Design a protein around this ligand. Structure first.
Ligand SMILES: Cc1ccc(Nc2cc(N[C@@H]3CCCC[C@@H]3N)nnc2C(N)=O)nc1C
Length: 277
């Protein structure tokens, strides 16, 4: 899990940023080949060991995860600051990508979000909760290969319960969070299913923000009235129905990722069939 700093080559060039630190590109000298990597580098802290073991927990989460639609952790490295080293998804976050490519085809969008449901189905089976599932946190390896990343808020569930109970917190991505998260601070796979719904909407809206121009409270207000974001331009009705099904207020009646993955899998093949015609 710990890596040799003298096998890692960083590039002065920065790729991204978040109030944990920054994202840069680099290379790790593997056994025979050199492998390209993305590295999370910490705001060299205080000494406020908050970020420090968020990174540690995040990395311990990721080393348990083995799946083609989850980003892979290469390892950690302590130097100037703390570094989390991951396999690189070159095309970057899904939302920025679709914002810069308004003419990706609908079928290609279905392909990518179904790939995300396969990763989440696996995550569900593994009794991990992601708690930050958004389009900014889906990364493109190619225009036809998506992976889930950014496991900073993630939790492994206890063997005796089906949800995780937040106690405190910093900012929450409220617009992606299910009502039971905001109301009872309970996070489960079903509430990841709710976020996946918002993720679908972002995707079919080519990277536009959900609940445009509203604050958390206006969002909570809308949803309690039973209101929901409408159908994005050009989004198939079957995919919009699945969105609304993900936004089932009542957790018990909201589907899990097995049902959601199967629904997407079938519809993608129906579309692949029609296209051949
Ligand atoms: C242009 C570009 C290209 C590749 C990546 N790659 C990654 C980015 C990332 N986290 C950031 C945090 C800030 C918001 C966007 C994103 N969720 N985590 N892991 C990778 C990875 N393993 O590849 N990022 C960018 C910005």
């Amino acid at each position: 899990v710990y890596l040799d700093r003298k096998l890692l080559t960083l590039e002065d060039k920065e790729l991204g940023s978040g109030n944990f630190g920054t994202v840069k590109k680099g290379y790790y000298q593997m056994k025979k080949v050199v492998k390209t990597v993305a590295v999370k580098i910490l705001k060299n802290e205080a000494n406020d060991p908050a970020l420090k073991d968020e990174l540690l927990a995040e990395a311990n989460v990721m080393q348990q995860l083995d799946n083609p639609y989850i980003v892979r952790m290469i390892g950690i490295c302590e130097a100037e600051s703390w570094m989390l080293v991951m396999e690189m998804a070159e095309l970057g976050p899904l939302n920025k990508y679709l914002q810069q490519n308004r003419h990706v085809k609908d079928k290609n969008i279905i392909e990518l979000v179904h790939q995300v449901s396969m990763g989440m189905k696996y995550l569900e089976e593994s009794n991990f909760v992601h708690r930050d599932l958004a389009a900014r946190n889906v990364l493109l390896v190619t225009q036809h290969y998506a992976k889930i990343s950014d496991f900073g808020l993630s939790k492994a569930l206890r063997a005796d319960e089906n949800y995780y109970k937040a106690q405190t917190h910093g900012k929450w991505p409220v617009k992606w969070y299910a009502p039971e998260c905001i109301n009872y601070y309970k996070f489960s796979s079903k509430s990841d299913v709710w976020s996946f719904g918002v993720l679908m909407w972002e995707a079919f809206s080519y990277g536009q923000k959900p609940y445009r121009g509203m604050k958390g409270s206006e969002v909570t207000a809308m949803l309690e009235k039973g209101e929901r974001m409408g159908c994005p331009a050009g989004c198939p009705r079957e995919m919009y129905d699945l969105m609304n099904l993900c936004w089932t207020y009542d957790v018990e009646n909201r589907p899990g990722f097995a049902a959601v993955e199967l629904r997407l899998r079938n519809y993608y093949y129906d579309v692949v069939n029609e296209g051949h015609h």
